[PDB]
Amino acid sequence: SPPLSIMGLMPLTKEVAKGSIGRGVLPAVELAIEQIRNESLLRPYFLDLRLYDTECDNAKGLKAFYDAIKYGPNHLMVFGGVCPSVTSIIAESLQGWNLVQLSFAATTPVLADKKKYPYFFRTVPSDNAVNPAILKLLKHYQWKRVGTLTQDVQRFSEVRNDLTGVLYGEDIEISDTESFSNDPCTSVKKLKGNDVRIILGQFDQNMAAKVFCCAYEENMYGSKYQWIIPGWYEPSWWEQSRCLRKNLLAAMEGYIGVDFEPLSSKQIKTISGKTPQQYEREYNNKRSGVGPSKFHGYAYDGIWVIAKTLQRAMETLHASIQDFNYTDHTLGRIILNAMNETNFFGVTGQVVFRNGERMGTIKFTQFQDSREVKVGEYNAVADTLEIINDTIRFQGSEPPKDKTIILEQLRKISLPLYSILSALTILGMIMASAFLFFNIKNRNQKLIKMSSPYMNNLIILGGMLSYASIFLFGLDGSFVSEKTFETLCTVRTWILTVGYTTAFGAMFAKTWRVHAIFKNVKLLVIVGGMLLIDLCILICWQAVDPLRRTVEKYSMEPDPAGRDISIRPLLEHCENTHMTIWLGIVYAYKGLLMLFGCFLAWETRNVSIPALNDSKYIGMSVYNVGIMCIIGAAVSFLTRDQPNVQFCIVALVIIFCSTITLCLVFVPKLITLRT
Amino acid sequence: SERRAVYIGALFPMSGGWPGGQACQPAVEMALEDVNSRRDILPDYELKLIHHDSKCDPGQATKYLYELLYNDPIKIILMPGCSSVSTLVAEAARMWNLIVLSYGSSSPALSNRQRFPTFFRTHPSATLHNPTRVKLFEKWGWKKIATIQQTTEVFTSTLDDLEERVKEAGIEITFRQSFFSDPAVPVKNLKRQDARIIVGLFYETEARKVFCEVYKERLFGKKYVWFLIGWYADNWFKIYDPSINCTVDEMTEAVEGHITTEIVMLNPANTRSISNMTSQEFVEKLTKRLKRHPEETGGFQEAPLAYDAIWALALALNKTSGVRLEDFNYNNQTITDQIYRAMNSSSFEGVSGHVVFDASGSRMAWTLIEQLQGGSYKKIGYYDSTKDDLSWSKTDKWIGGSPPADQTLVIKTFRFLSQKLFISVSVLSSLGIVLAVVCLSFNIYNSHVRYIQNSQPNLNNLTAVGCSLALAAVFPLGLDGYHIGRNQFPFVCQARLWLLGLGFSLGYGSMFTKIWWVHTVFTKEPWKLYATVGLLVGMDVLTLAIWQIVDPLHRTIETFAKEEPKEDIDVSILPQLEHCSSRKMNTWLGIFYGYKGLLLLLGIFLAYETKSVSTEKINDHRAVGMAIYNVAVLCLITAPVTMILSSQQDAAFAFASLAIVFSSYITLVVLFVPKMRRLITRG
Ligand SMILES: CC(C)CCC[C@@H](C)[C@H]1CC[C@H]2[C@@H]3CC=C4C[C@@H](O)CC[C@]4(C)[C@H]3CC[C@]12C
Ligand SMILES: CC(C)CCC[C@@H](C)[C@H]1CC[C@H]2[C@@H]3CC=C4C[C@@H](O)CC[C@]4(C)[C@H]3CC[C@]12C
Ligand SMILES: CC(C)CCC[C@@H](C)[C@H]1CC[C@H]2[C@@H]3CC=C4C[C@@H](O)CC[C@]4(C)[C@H]3CC[C@]12C
């Protein structure tokens, strides 16, 4: 029985950290060879593994590899290698000796290249094997906006650089890209500035607590945000500081950890004749001295791959091993093609190599309040994701979307308030029509003939046109159209200034003729000239810069509904060109005319008996109509943002201003003409 | 002659990325003869060489290092080639206790005494350009630097040492970039960032792309200066390359006048080394042994260094022979410690000059600084760094005679009113003040005669003394920088604010009450007149006191957009205009202007009302109405204009003081000349 020697390199001391891996798979490989000798897989010969300790160091590993070449027997292929640097040094140099290497723990992506390392094969999936998993998670939840948060080590920069190249060609954009070295959360504040809710974190075990407590200080959790991080951390890793524990446990709820799957679940018979569960119980009975490690199934599949490759190579050679020196290379090409042709079923799934990488399975886990639990899997051979339905949950009800939805939600005015004010002004309209009917019925009278009743007809028509404006005031928003609004406001400012000008010109002309008759110790051209001036400024308004619709928008502040969308409240206005020119001139001209009329009414202060019987209450009405019009225009300047209020207070000011001056002219008429 | 052997293992790269061993291999062997013939040093030993090709590839250097370390003749030192092979060999040689003495490894990562404990090299590291660049930054006063970079790790460690070197000399990097194969977007960001001191760090085949992209985006020129690395070929822009849409006659204007720095291998002097040899005869002797020309073989420039490397080892075996060397095995740690202490302190004169190592294993040497000047390089200086000796040679031909500066400088010029329009209006104001005081004295002199005693005394005098101060309030309206300095702007400001307000309020209050009382007595007693005047003046000084309390006035500078001088070619000039203001200057005089406008418009109507229906022959005015007419038409036309045109330099002062001199001339002409035309002309 000639032996078949296999070189094994693994950390086998207790003084290093990753040496805890190297002992932990030593039962399982011991479990495998005893099967291959029992069935007599290598009938012509028998397998023999020779162990060597590299101690996870470049110099020690290179010296041990050289001593294993020099003093040991004729090896055929290398098995093992755990640390990334020592595997890099050996894997670059295998080709000079025509040896093929098979790893089970080298998870670095650098060994994916087949120009530098052409004789390398591993059975553990790499660190880039999570990148076509997260993609097929996003298409399951239709998320398309993501934001990456990367640590500045090479080990994570390779993963991020592969993710960039694998998201290309799809309907997924990378709205933000970040990096940090020691300061985590100015970067997550910049991520909060763009307001993204899907984060693909890539960072080690130390910075995770810092990122999550800095998110708790930023309140980046709840049923809005989603975290997707690696899942090869230690169990209960949160216990080892400054941050508060229960706050961290409330901030860390609901992340998705991505990892490689330790053992398969599809309970079929493998190539050894067992189940995954039987193998797990056997290895658990074997491992009684030491703790477990998550690489043992991959070591089992590696031993079976080595055995099947040697069997295929022997069957190929006998159709033309104990004489193999490193000077041969045709035997190396034979063993290389035989390992390239590997396709079978083992305890971790369908063992198959594509370009020197294992096409294996990826495991998603989610954190629930004390522990992480398996919430799905992704088979990368057939490219399919399987999510267990009744285990994955969120805080809210729906899977949270990437960006919030904006809504217009125009600010309207209350129909009860509008109806109440329309009723008030329509009863004022009835009162004004009743006063006009009385004064036109009692025309021929020796009290009405000496009181200039045509000017009173002018003041009733002015009050009528002032009353009629409130209907055209505030037909805004959700009431008529989008095209009447460009004409309704210009016809409103057409009618309102005429209704003001007629009445105030009548009262001012009455007071002016009182002063002119008093001084010397026909009519109707004054209001004609004033109407001419205001119609001129109105046609100059309409012909040059007409008032049109213009919308103002707020900054999307409130969220009052609870349906988790943002609303952006917006208002309508009739103002388009300059609005500090054609309002300041009109307001200043009307204010100066008002103050001149008020001073002229004070200068008499009721000394004239014979010609006009009512100059007293006419001057009282001028006084009246000035001050409340001033406070109405001032309060209109004050609350130029809020709607229900300014319409109501302008309506109250105008109904008071038009119902008091219609009382003070015609109320003595009723008392003296009924008596 | 016994002449026992001592062996030296070596890896010479015959091909690959840096084919140095085509020239470094004979230059070692020739040098070995010069140690084996001279009987002064190593009198009984004989150095022999065992070499292997390595192709600058660790995948074969590992096998050849196994062949060296595990065969019969015991080696005593190792001599690798490229950077990667030397990294592998120097990290691996700790477990066998071997000195590693490279000759061509220029990584900055090999100066880590923690990782590589027994390393020595004679090629200096690529962190020797950085003291030369720091010295060339302190010499010309530059203080802001942009760095573009190809993302190979050697350039990354070079810049990460440059930052630590430059932050202790008061200079700071403002801009970093990186690229892999297409330099378009970093030169775009360099164009939009507008930096002018660039330190480029990339290989040749990227330089031929990035410099004609610099030409296409027009980043070169009069105000720009680059910095490159010096071991390019001397016609690296004049060669043809189909990977760019750029022309050979083009980009020769774009690489114009860029400084390069490089290590100097061969000794520029002509003295004698320790081998009794000079530089030119060393090149002449070496050119015999080569089978080709020096321009076509690789590694010709590094071939001196290997020479000195051999000589260094020879001296390190002369200062220890006194344990013998025919007994060195791979386990005893002692003899390597003797050799390490002997080679830690080494200082001699070889073909490359003064050879002496650092404390981290590197080699300190000179630096050459050259510049492109019209298509060909020109040596413009040398620099020693271990004792800080610059050697300039007066050849830095710039474009404007002087080196440009990093950023454009701002000039905060001021803008003052022309002094002729100040001085003419001030002398008109002094003519006004003498006319006012002579009219006041004339009216106060005839205080008994019943033409002005019965009409209105003590009121026109008050109008005149109000207009006196109102005319005197135009001297502090034109004192900003040309005749006054600073830190008394509150004095001039409170002066102009109290003086003009007091004068106008007093004068118009008097002339307003003289119309108000005749109106209120015509339509059906000096104490009530004095009460009205004092009440108006008290209310006006009350609101000026409220101005004094809440928001006082101080100086405030505004500025316009920048302009161009067009006597230099690069200065940025911004104009500054300073004036008195407060935080609420538009409203806090808007109230005063509106109140005075309402008072003025009240007065003009009564002045028209009591025109010729006076019949009030106890006042005898008839022309105070005209004195209110002209002041009302003149102040209301220059009150909003001097707040509209406040951005203009001198038109505001012109209109304000012109209105003030007209409105104080005419109110004294039309009020006082009939008071003397009827008395001391009709006398
Ligand atoms: C729109 C509504 C509010 C307007 C109503 C106008 C009212 C206030 C007017 C119209 C008729 C007026 C009445 C006419 C007759 C009299 C009888 C007299 O001995 C007392 C006053 C009194 C009772 C008057 C009070 C005011 C009066 C009731
Ligand atoms: C009878 C006369 C006095 C009526 C004249 C109407 C005048 C005041 C109107 C007609 C056109 C208007 C102008 C229209 C355009 C502009 C340009 C803008 O950038 C500033 C305002 C300004 C300059 C407006 C000011 C007021 C204006 C000049
Ligand atoms: C009878 C005549 C003299 C009265 C004329 C009133 C004049 C002076 C008013 C009416 C319109 C006003 C203009 C309204 C708009 C503007 C545009 C602004 O950018 C500068 C001021 C300016 C130019 C105003 C100046 C004063 C103005 C021209």
Ligand SMILES: CC(C)CCC[C@@H](C)[C@H]1CC[C@H]2[C@@H]3CC=C4C[C@@H](O)CC[C@]4(C)[C@H]3CC[C@]12C
């Ligand atoms: C009796 C009449 C002549 C008095 C009229 C007072 C006039 C001159 C006042 C009242 C409102 C004032 C305007 C208020 C607003 C502005 C807009 C500003 O951008 C330019 C100045 C300008 C245009 C002002 C000029 C002067 C002004 C038009």
Ligand SMILES: CC(C)CCC[C@@H](C)[C@H]1CC[C@H]2[C@@H]3CC=C4C[C@@H](O)CC[C@]4(C)[C@H]3CC[C@]12C
């Ligand atoms: C007799 C009196 C009542 C007439 C006064 C005319 C007033 C109302 C006019 C003259 C100048 C005008 C101001 C001109 C400038 C501005 C600044 C602007 O950002 C807001 C509007 C505001 C503040 C205007 C509001 C109306 C205004 C104050």
Ligand SMILES: CC(C)CCC[C@@H](C)[C@H]1CC[C@H]2[C@@H]3CC=C4C[C@@H](O)CC[C@]4(C)[C@H]3CC[C@]12C
């Ligand atoms: C901004 C401008 C257009 C506003 C001007 C307001 C004008 C129209 C006002 C102010 C003073 C008023 C005048 C006051 C006095 C008289 C004398 C009287 O026997 C005829 C009417 C007449 C002539 C008035 C007509 C209207 C009038 C001229």
Ligand SMILES: CC(C)CCC[C@@H](C)[C@H]1CC[C@H]2[C@@H]3CC=C4C[C@@H](O)CC[C@]4(C)[C@H]3CC[C@]12C
């Ligand atoms: C909304 C509220 C504030 C508006 C109230 C309008 C007030 C201010 C008006 C309406 C009636 C007016 C009064 C009418 C009659 C007189 C009697 C007279 O000898 C003194 C003035 C006085 C007392 C007036 C003062 C102002 C007055 C009270």
Ligand SMILES: CC(C)CCC[C@@H](C)[C@H]1CC[C@H]2[C@@H]3CC=C4C[C@@H](O)CC[C@]4(C)[C@H]3CC[C@]12C
């Ligand atoms: C908008 C507001 C400020 C306008 C108010 C107009 C005021 C100032 C008017 C309206 C009624 C007037 C009053 C009418 C009656 C009297 C009684 C008399 O023995 C003293 C003057 C006095 C007290 C008047 C002072 C001015 C007065 C109060």
Ligand SMILES: CC(C)CCC[C@@H](C)[C@H]1CC[C@H]2[C@@H]3CC=C4C[C@@H](O)CC[C@]4(C)[C@H]3CC[C@]12C
């Ligand atoms: C004797 C003093 C107290 C009277 C002063 C009258 C004041 C209160 C009046 C005159 C001009 C008015 C302003 C006119 C314009 C605006 C701009 C608007 O967006 C807010 C209201 C505001 C700011 C008004 C508030 C009240 C106001 C400042």
Ligand SMILES: CC(C)CCC[C@@H](C)[C@H]1CC[C@H]2[C@@H]3CC=C4C[C@@H](O)CC[C@]4(C)[C@H]3CC[C@]12C
């Ligand atoms: C809806 C309510 C508020 C409307 C009431 C209308 C009131 C204000 C009207 C109706 C009758 C009027 C009164 C008629 C008679 C007089 C007697 C006179 O010597 C003083 C005025 C006085 C006292 C009037 C004041 C105003 C008056 C009371």
Ligand SMILES: CC(C)CCC[C@@H](C)[C@H]1CC[C@H]2[C@@H]3CC=C4C[C@@H](O)CC[C@]4(C)[C@H]3CC[C@]12C
């Ligand atoms: C006789 C007195 C009461 C008349 C005073 C007229 C006053 C009310 C006018 C003149 C200048 C005007 C101001 C012009 C500029 C501004 C700045 C703006 O951001 C808010 C409004 C505000 C503050 C205006 C409010 C009204 C204002 C202060």
Ligand SMILES: CC(C)CCC[C@@H](C)[C@H]1CC[C@H]2[C@@H]3CC=C4C[C@@H](O)CC[C@]4(C)[C@H]3CC[C@]12C
């Ligand atoms: C905007 C402008 C028009 C408002 C001006 C308010 C004016 C009318 C007020 C403020 C101070 C008041 C004066 C206070 C003192 C006196 C002295 C007394 O023996 C006669 C009345 C008289 C002369 C008052 C008349 C009215 C008055 C002048």
Ligand SMILES: CC(C)CCC[C@@H](C)[C@H]1CC[C@H]2[C@@H]3CC=C4C[C@@H](O)CC[C@]4(C)[C@H]3CC[C@]12C
């Ligand atoms: C904005 C400004 C112009 C409004 C000013 C309102 C002025 C005109 C009001 C407020 C107080 C009033 C005064 C109240 C008291 C008196 C005393 C009396 O014996 C004569 C009238 C007189 C002097 C009034 C005239 C008008 C008056 C001054």
Ligand SMILES: CC(C)CCC[C@@H](C)[C@H]1CC[C@H]2[C@@H]3CC=C4C[C@@H](O)CC[C@]4(C)[C@H]3CC[C@]12C
């Ligand atoms: C701020 C307010 C009070 C200022 C108003 C200025 C007033 C008083 C000026 C402007 C226009 C002037 C009028 C111009 C034309 C006439 C027609 C003439 O046959 C009688 C005088 C009369 C009626 C003038 C009286 C005074 C007057 C009305």
Ligand SMILES: CC(C)CCC[C@@H](C)[C@H]1CC[C@H]2[C@@H]3CC=C4C[C@@H](O)CC[C@]4(C)[C@H]3CC[C@]12C
């Ligand atoms: C801004 C502009 C419109 C204001 C102009 C103010 C004007 C209306 C004032 C200032 C000077 C006044 C004039 C003063 C002198 C006279 C001569 C007299 O025999 C007839 C009235 C008349 C002709 C006055 C009419 C009104 C007048 C012209």
Ligand SMILES: CC(C)CCC[C@@H](C)[C@H]1CC[C@H]2[C@@H]3CC=C4C[C@@H](O)CC[C@]4(C)[C@H]3CC[C@]12C
């Ligand atoms: C009787 C009448 C003529 C007096 C009117 C007083 C006028 C001229 C005063 C009152 C308010 C003042 C305005 C206050 C605010 C501003 C806004 C500022 O950005 C430009 C100046 C401007 C536009 C002022 C110009 C002068 C102004 C319009």
Ligand SMILES: C[C@H](NC[C@H](O)CP(=O)(O)CC1CCCCC1)c1ccc(Cl)c(Cl)c1
């Ligand atoms: C000046 C420099 N001296 C040696 C250099 O530092 C050795 P290096 O640092 O190991 C880089 C090599 C390796 C790959 C191919 C050429 C460059 C140099 C650079 C490029 C070239 Cl092609 C040569 Cl010949 C020399």
